[PDB]
Amino acid sequence: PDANGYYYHDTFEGSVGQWTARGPAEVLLSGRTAYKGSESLLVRNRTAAWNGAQRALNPRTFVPGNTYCFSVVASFIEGASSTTFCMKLQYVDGSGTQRYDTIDMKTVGPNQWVHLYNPQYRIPSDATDMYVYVATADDTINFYIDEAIGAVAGTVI
Ligand SMILES: [Ca+2]
Secondary structure, eight states: OOTTSEEEEEOOSSOOTTOEEESSOEEEEESSOOSSTTOEEEEEOOSSTTOEEEEEOOTTTSOTTOEEEEEEEEEOOSSSSOEEEEEEEEEEOTTSOEEEEEEEEEEEOTTOOEEEEEEEEEOOTTOEEEEEEEEESSOOOOEEEEEEEEEETTOOO
16 A cells, blocks of 8 residues: 555556456557556457456455445547446456446547546455456447556545
8 A cells, every 4th residue: 555545556657567358358558648658558359348458456455345446547549439438346256156346437539538436436245356347338449548546445536
């Protein structure tokens, strides 16, 4: 928990951190557009809306039943006239069933960064094998994320 209450903070300025592809997509650093610095994380090769970018959450830091802050900014340049970005928690519940709970969602047009943000998100008490992820609702556009943050509940960004 750094000086600003962040547990992780991905600027994507030289490193993808713990971010990986969700589904058969691919993620990589890109200098084509950025929210801060000169880079962001590009997400491409998606073949279904559920494909995207994900990051495993360590249960020792993000304790189920506890409340935390999550933040990311996203944008796209082409492929659609608008999209709906979703930041979500993928997890396995107490019955062994994989669940998808929405943290934040925002609709936006091309060439505009949008702030996916929830300073008061409660992780379900029974969650295991957790991942925070970003995808869209119903398209397969390439998209970019930047400034990916996991923080203490109440953290203003
Ligand atoms: Ca950046």
